[PDB]
Point group: D2
Chain length 315, copies 4
């Protein structure tokens, strides 16, 4: 009956598109929160009018007070920095972001614990796989109520590139990128299908070659960098990805999506967050799916988790 209340903790580039999309889908009431005075109210005022064009009925208001987290059903955290100062577009790496972004999670976690402990939480702030757990530790929310953005966005790239080469509906391509969001992303060739058919079949048929696939792989891992060098840290697709995830929770869709979640033994790991297929429903994370990886694949997973494990010690 009541509309879900959605709090965008951070109203920069991603938060802007997220608000637009939420109204388009009439998904819930929106608070656009930020540290920067004024900006949020303006983005919110602008976004609010689209209610007419979209046949929607969602309030959109800006905020500068953590008090607006009260009674939140969904909280989305994009608070932080894209770049590190003194670095050039070339040297862009998500790693160099522990610097300006670690403290922010501590703060935000405190307020969440006090204002909306029953909310479902999605963390985006880089380096996500580390930040997600930090926020989880400070917010006190249950393990099934917090996830980080990753697979959905990374696979959307791989899915889309394959679809262009094969000339089919992008949604018709399925793929899995697990372990961690970042340069050690694990792309699983064996788990790629097109129209439900193993990719190998298309290679045997010479519709696509192993090399063009490898090319596509490279382009997938380095896409954020390619975009950073062309314009700025990606924000449109990140937005759609997060919202596909939020929507699955709010509408209880029970979609299978690859998100950063807490491992309790899966893949032989514990006390850390890693990307893997999950099911997002109205109870939050309904189920975590463990891919039955082979020897070589496990090795890759292990390496990505170590990269997350290493930065963790950096605080």
């Amino acid at each position: 009956a009541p509309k879900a209340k959605i709090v965008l903790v951070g109203s920069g580039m991603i938060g802007g598109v997220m608000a637009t999309l939420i109204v388009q889908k009439n998904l819930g009431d929106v608070v656009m929160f930020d540290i920067v005075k004024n900006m949020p109210h303006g983005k919110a005022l602008d976004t609010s009018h689209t209610n007419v064009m979209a046949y929607s009925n969602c309030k959109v208001s800006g905020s500068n007070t953590y008090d607006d987290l009260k009674d939140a059903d969904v909280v989305i955290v994009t608070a932080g920095f894209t770049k590190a100062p003194g670095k050039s577009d070339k040297e862009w790496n998500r790693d160099d972001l522990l610097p300006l972004n670690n403290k922010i999670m501590i703060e935000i976690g405190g307020h969440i614990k006090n204002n909306c402990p029953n909310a479902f939480i999605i963390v985006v702030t880089n380096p996500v796989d580390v930040m997600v757990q930090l926020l989880h530790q400070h917010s006190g929310v249950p393990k099934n109520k917090i996830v980080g953005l990753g697979g959905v966005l990374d696979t959307s790239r791989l899915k889309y590139y394959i679809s262009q080469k094969l000339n089919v509906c992008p949604r018709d391509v399925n793929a899995h990128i697990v372990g961690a969001h970042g340069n050690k992303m694990v792309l699983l060739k064996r788990y790629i299908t097109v129209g439900g058919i193993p990719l190998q079949e298309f290679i045997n048929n010479k519709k696509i070659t192993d090399q063009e696939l490898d090319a596509i792989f490279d382009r997938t891992i380095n896409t954020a960098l390619e975009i950073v060098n062309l314009h700025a840290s990606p924000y449109v697709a990140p937005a759609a990805a997060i919202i596909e995830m939020a929507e699955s929770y709010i509408r209880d869709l029970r979609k299978v999506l690859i998100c950063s979640t807490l491992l309790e033994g899966q893949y032989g790991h514990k006390d850390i967050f890693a990307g893997t297929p999950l099911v997002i429903g109205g109870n939050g994370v309904e189920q975590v799916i463990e891919l039955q990886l082979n020897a070589d694949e496990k090795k890759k997973f292990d390496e990505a988790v170590a990269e997350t494990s290493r930065m963790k010690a950096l605080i």
Copy 2:
């Protein structure tokens, strides 16, 4: 710019739902044709009013003249009988339909050749794999411009049942049923994925058993009969399935869908229509996808094709 013109050749149970769905999706102008006097004009009047509730702008008119096929962009043929005089609901079989519906194809084909030779055609009339080729022969349209309903409907059942057992979004289950629509339908266990993951992984995990899967199989094959025995020849899912197909042609979606199409050597067969994955886009059938079947799977394919072959001889 102009709206597509869609002609439903047959306006019974399936035609009724198709028209409703077309207005919902603002998919194109609709002519509801039938030989029964007046009935279609009423269904059409009723349906036209939903343009208001759906924010659409599609005309819906009834017809009793083949003249209305003129300039059609899409023609959907459901004309015929759902079952067979002197027959009980328990002995229901789409095969006893050669009696009831052969001649109708010849008549309709002639008018199509005359009024809309460039239309995309979808045949539903059972037994579909035979009927579609008959309409193909008398209408004269190119092989990439005509398909029969089958896989989309059969897999929706298999996908749905599995999804109930696994507790995931039904769209997240992918599966293939090929060869023929009917009792000899080929259900390919090896081609089933959930969230892009091989079904075998969920069986290994004890999420679903081989036995439960086989039961789901029997259910899938006997679904039409189960519904006939509870109410009547199924028509809501058949309609949605057809519209998914028509929509992919009208909007140039390029979805991979399993439909009855003319085989020119694939799977070792020719001069006959059989169900297989294919791509539907703005040009019609953009590509036929031949599954690289193993020896066991090929055997079953050939048995389904043989049933189609047998009925074809009954002329």
Copy 3:
């Protein structure tokens, strides 16, 4: 988070389309209830498969027990007869329906009181303005939680016909038909706009004439009869209209819709249900809007209410 639970009390022609539309819009879980054995389980099985084609996640099950009303969020009552034994299609009149459908309301009301006292209820069963108050009396629900189908359906016809004549989007025509659903329906010329512009301006411009408008009026009033005479009691538009209403409650849309509601002094009447603009939101009927009618318009209102009053006495 949880999906709304929707119970269709009656699963004939209108119930069938309602269930289809609910899946299309992923609006909630559906129970298709009826007294006819087996029929609803079949319609429900058929309908459930469309979850795949529609990217939805709504359960659809049949029922023959009032037990399934338990915890319903929305209940829609279509239970009854569409016409009347020994009567011809030409003498069709929603009034001869007191015979056919009074007692059914008492029975249903009792079970509602027992199983789902907090549900939002929509009555369709003709003659609706009488039936809705009967169900209101026996079910015990609050006045803001029960309405009858009428204005939304009647105006969709008037809006559509005008839109055809003027060549505009049907949603761009706005109009009001109040008082009662039936032959005494009050069509208010003064309250007609096109793109927010008074209809009179288009008449002054010679875009439509007074005569054409009056013809459109006769058509609007006699639409059900025209369709009965061509096919059967209308059900596709009635269904879309009901779902528009249910959707505005479930998604908290706060749309202004004309429904049958309990009058407590508005228009000079009380202790009776009559059609008038109202707002449907998450709380149910959020506000009843009383049109500031002139002397001529009031006269007509009173005549419609008197017809409802007369039939009420036939107990």
Copy 4:
């Protein structure tokens, strides 16, 4: 069948949201064109991935060459400046934009005439009512194939503000703001309706007062300024508005929308563009609607057109 080809001539803030929205609605293939090297390709790459999340199939590519206008079905012109240099947020006025924006139209018109003379054109660049005609003069396209952004955006504000005060679905409020986009906007109190009911009725009922309406009026005329002072020149709602207009053309919706169009006698004016209700269909502007204004209202219209007429002489 084929997808519409849509060229965004200008890829700044508005162009960015427009591309996002087009993919969401699967409305057509997109070229994101601009003078600034690199930026466009990046925004395009980013936007392209959302195809997966949105079930869409639209190509999104960047461009720096006017050659990409070839075969365009829709061209949208946002090319230019928001601000004037040396001016503060306080002194922001759309007038001070003849400066940096006039020449741009000449250029773009030449290419349009040579690359896509059959396209439908929407102009946004401020001051729109002047720029639209300039572009019309240089492009040579027919009067029914070119319009400027105005009413839709300005009314969305008025509609939304009224809806908040009255607590109804924003789409349920209808209003007209004609003459010119800018500080002399003509807000027509007499043409405001809520749920199709004259606003006066709600004032008589004391649901809203004349003063709060006047307040709302002020806020409507100064909204861009309020947003400019809070963040930046509005871009989200502008985007949705333009796209509602584009969509009506591509899907042949025949919606009634207030856009800047060429007057040939209407309201007693000629050889100039002014905002007024129009119908946008697949032939472009199907009809221009002349509001039958009264003496006071005409005076206001005349004043807004003079403001457009004055700036025209400024070149």
